[PDB]
């Protein structure tokens, strides 16, 4: 009775909304996808080239929704990681921005996000409901 996305296991949650988006079609995967490593700190590109962008997107929808507003930058640092600079020590490297951006500009078309004051993206009521809706379905996955 009354389920938020914060009532759902995250990995179970984002695993599902991704699916929800590849069996909805109307995301908007950019032209590359098969050639980007998500961050200049990675080494190889994402292995499930079909759905990483879906997993990515889904998390962000979840991630922006548990907040007030989060811009592209904070996403790049969030989905950045460690770079192995070779014979030199490791350090944090922010992630690709035209990946998170085309995620946040294409989330805007489907109405899961929208521009917002104080900069950045805010979860929409259309999005709030879409996430709270598919949340419950994952909750009641007990037959």
Partner 1 sequence: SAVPSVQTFGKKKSATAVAHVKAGKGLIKVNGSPITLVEPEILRFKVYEPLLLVGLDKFSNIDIRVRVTGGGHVSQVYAIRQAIAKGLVAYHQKYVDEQSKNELKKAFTSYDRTLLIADSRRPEPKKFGGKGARSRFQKSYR
Partner 2 sequence: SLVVQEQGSFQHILRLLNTNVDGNIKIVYALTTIKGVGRRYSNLVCKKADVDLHKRAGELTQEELERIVQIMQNPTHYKIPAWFLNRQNDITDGKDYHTLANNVESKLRDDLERLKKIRAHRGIRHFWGLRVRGQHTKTTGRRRA
User: Which tokens hold the place of 142?
Assistant: 């007990």
The closest alpha carbon to 64, from 115, 1, 133, belongs to 115
Site for RNA in 83-102 (CB under 7 A): 83-94, 96-99, 101-102
Q: Is 141 in the site for partner 1 (CB under 8 A)?
A: no
Distance of closest approach, residue 48 Cβ to partner 2, in angstroms: 10
Identify any residues that bridge with 103 across adjacent strands, giving them in sequence order.
none
Specify burial of residue 23 (Cβ count, 10 A radius: 0-12, 13-18, 19+).
exposed
The single residue among 47, 140, 142, 143 that binds RNA, judged by CB under 7 A, is: 47
Q: Is 114 in the site for RNA (CB under 7 A)?
A: no
Please state the φ and ψ torsions of residue 135, each to the nearest 5 degrees: -60, -55
Which one of 31-39, 77-85, 110-118, 129-137 is the stretch in contact with partner 2 (CB under 8 A)? 31-39
Residues in contact with partner 2 by the rule CB under 8 A: 31, 34-35, 44-45, 49
């Amino acid at each position: 009775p009354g389920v938020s996305v914060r009532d759902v296991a995250a990995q179970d949650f984002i695993n599902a909304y991704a699916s929800f988006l590849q069996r909805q079609g109307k995301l908007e995967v950019p032209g590359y996808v098969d050639i980007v490593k998500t961050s200049s700190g990675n080494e190889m590109p994402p292995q499930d080239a079909e759905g990483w962008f879906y997993k990515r997107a889904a998390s962000v929808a979840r991630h922006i929704y548990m907040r007030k507003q989060v811009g592209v930058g904070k996403l790049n640092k969030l989905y950045g990681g460690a770079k192995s600079r070779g014979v030199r020590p490791y350090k944090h490297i922010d992630a690709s921005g035209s990946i998170n951006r085309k995620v946040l500009q294409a989330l805007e078309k489907i109405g899961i996000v929208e521009i917002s004051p104080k900069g950045g993206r805010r979860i929409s009521e259309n999005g709030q409901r879409d996430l709270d809706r598919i949340a419950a379905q994952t909750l009641e996955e007990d037959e």
